[PDB]
Design a protein around this nucleic acid. Structure first.
Lengths: 52, 58, 76
RNA sequence: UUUUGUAUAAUGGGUCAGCGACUUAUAUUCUGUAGCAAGGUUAACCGAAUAGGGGAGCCGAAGGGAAACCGAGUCUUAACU
RNA sequence: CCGACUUACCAACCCGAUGCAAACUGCGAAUACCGGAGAAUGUUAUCACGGGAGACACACGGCGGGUGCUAACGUCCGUCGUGAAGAGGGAAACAACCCAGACCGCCAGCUAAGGUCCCAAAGUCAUGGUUAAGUGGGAAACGAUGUGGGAAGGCCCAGAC
RNA sequence: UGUAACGGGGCUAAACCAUGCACCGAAGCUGCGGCAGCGACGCUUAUGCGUUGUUGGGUAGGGGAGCGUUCUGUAAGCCUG
RNA sequence: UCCUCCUAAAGAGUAACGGAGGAGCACGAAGGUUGGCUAAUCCUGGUCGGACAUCAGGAGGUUAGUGCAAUGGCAUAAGCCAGCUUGACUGCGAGCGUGACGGCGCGAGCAGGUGCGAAAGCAGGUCAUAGUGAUCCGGUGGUUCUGAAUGGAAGGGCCAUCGCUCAACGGAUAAAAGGUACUCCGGGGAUAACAGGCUGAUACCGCCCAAGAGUUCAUAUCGACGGCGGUGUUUGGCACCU
RNA sequence: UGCCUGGCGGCCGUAGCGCGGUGGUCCCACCUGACCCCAUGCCGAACUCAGAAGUGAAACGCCGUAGCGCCGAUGGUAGUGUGGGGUCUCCCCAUGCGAGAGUAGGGAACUGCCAGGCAU
């Protein structure tokens, strides 16, 4: 179970976040995707952050 | 109406559940009990189903 | 020994047989592969489950050049 | 009595007489019965007193939601066919 | 280097013929299961809600099997019957096998399984065969001019054994 | 331990096979009389009464209806030298 | 604890310290869409090149491949290649399947917004089935929902999520190994040791065929390779009696 | 209404291979050329565009042919539900259902809609 879990924080300034897993040894670069933000009701860019 | 007489000739103690249900469908209740039923394919099939223990006279 | 393990039964098989009136969305058969293929008014779910899309009576038939078993929902 | 199963060579009793085991208090649910009925009922207490007074309270006729809140509607959801 | 022939040797693929498989299927039942329609029968036998349970050690017999030695009144499942929780009659006796389900009384009748010489109720019943071992009234591989019935075959009054 | 592998006596059928007709045989079924439960049906229901089907083996257990015993009211009544 | 086949008796389900194998992961592409393609193996020819690299043609028709075990699928490909992308969306869900329950699983369609495609349409993860942990307590972010006189706040709620090889995997606690012949109590022949019972693998004693040993000659006496029984008789098997 | 060709089906081998023959007026296929539209992990082979000099050689369609594949009775066999029986590891009887394999045999598809070309 080397694949550890992370969270994708929205760029819209709202505190919303998705959650998923990634292999930090073979993909060191950050993750960026367009996901739906239900607070603003628009598809915004989500950026990878520390799960904490 | 072309009826026939069915008479139970053997006990239903050790018989199958389906056999007991067939006997109840025919209306037989004990050994020697005779009932009169219509001569239809359904009654004929029930008789043939439990033919070893009933006797039909026509 | 080393042969004591087994898995729980998945309760597969045909759940609604031919000529049975069903409501829309009801499962007809739970299968592993595509043993039966979806016909008219029947959809194929994520795990290859064939489900009715409209109310009617189930119809089994053999069709296609590969003699595949199709399930369709006859109009009612 | 216990058992799948006991004449069992499985348990108990020598015999007789007396005594010996689902009760009592307080709460809760269901059934029957009696009173009153969208109402029913009082507890401590007063009282020469199982009467009468006492409605402090409890249950019911409204519910939804975690809640503010709304209400024959309410919750989810930005909003529900 | 190429190679040379044949040698009671093994042998891929393919072709023909013949088997085996629970974890093989180009085939494939009977049953069982689900649904629809119809008639008859059954004291709603069916389902839902509420009050009270008990039970979660099962046993044998038939059929389909795993495991064991195709051992066990062995063990574990499916399904039915019986016992559990069920008396009566039969199998000598014998919860589980066969016949059959006890509301009570009768010094009445007919039958089931099983029987009919005596214990002990009922045929020393009728017709035609078989057995000579008390076989019936416990058992196998194998051995034998025991004996009854049937269809052929080889040698034979140019003489068979 | 004693015949001890028909239950026994005994049987050349009183064994076996095939056919047929009798009879015995159970708390099964039928007859007669009696008690009780549940459904149809009708009475003028004493709210249970004719007929009528049909049911009545039973452990754990569930439901219903009772007998009898001591004490209290009825009861300073009633029975009893 | 979970997954696949058989046992499993042609619907479902079904046990054993039954027969065989796997899982406690992986993937920002190995997911979505559009467009395109067809393997395994063998023969022939060809420089290093070889039984086997890459090339051309033929036979073959999925015996190949699927991220991994097995089963069921798959050519319209679910298998392989390329372009663009995040539907690995948020709130819901008619109606079913499977569970005693907790729960687990399939699902068209509605609303907003998105990707691919000209479009019809497809997309709520991966061909499907393993890849997992209830609750309590505590941590982080968002939201006046709540806030014990009032206004805040602390704490609590809701939404999103984290921390258990709690692996004895429905988890007794955050936290736990041994001896008793010094023993002791409540029970069970529900369960072992002795003996009895059923059976006879094992043990013992016979019998069937006869290659051979016996100078020649199977059967005077033995008898290989094999076969069929008897006794209850050793060690057992079962747990029916105590 | 007759033949041939093309497109979309019904059906999924009695419909599929193999062998021999045959077809170009139209249709279809190979064919000619590639600045352009578009394309090759190289290549106008595929995909794409602009066309008609040549050929039915390949492919494809049609016809014939039993060397295969395929379909397939009747009868018998195996299995089995119910009841009964035996010498009970396995069978038999009454009754109902009844295969698989194999045998005789069948078999070179049949059909619907539209369009084009040639004859009536």
């Amino acid at each position: 179970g080397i694949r550890e879990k992370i969270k994708l924080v929205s760029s819209a300034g709202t505190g919303h976040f998705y959650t998923t897993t990634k292999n930090k040894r073979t993909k060191p670069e950050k993750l960026e995707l367009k996901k739906f933000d239900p607070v603003v009701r628009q598809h915004v860019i989500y950026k990878e952050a520390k799960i904490k | 109406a072309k009826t026939i007489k069915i008479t139970q000739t053997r006990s239903a103690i050790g018989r199958l559940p389906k056999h007991k249900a067939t006997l109840l469908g025919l209306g037989l209740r004990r050994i020697g009990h005779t009932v009169e039923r219509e001569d239809t394919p359904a009654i004929r099939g029930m008789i043939n189903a439990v033919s070893f223990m009933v006797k039909v006279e026509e | 020994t080393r042969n004591g393990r087994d898995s729980e039964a998945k309760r597969l098989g045909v759940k609604r047989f031919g000529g049975e009136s069903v409501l829309a969305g009801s499962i007809i058969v739970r299968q592993r592969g595509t043993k039966f293929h979806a016909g008219a008014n029947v959809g194929c779910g994520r795990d290859h489950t064939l489900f009715a899309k409209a109310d009617g009576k189930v119809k089994f038939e053999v069709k296609g050049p590969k003699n595949r078993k199709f399930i369709s929902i006859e109009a009612e």
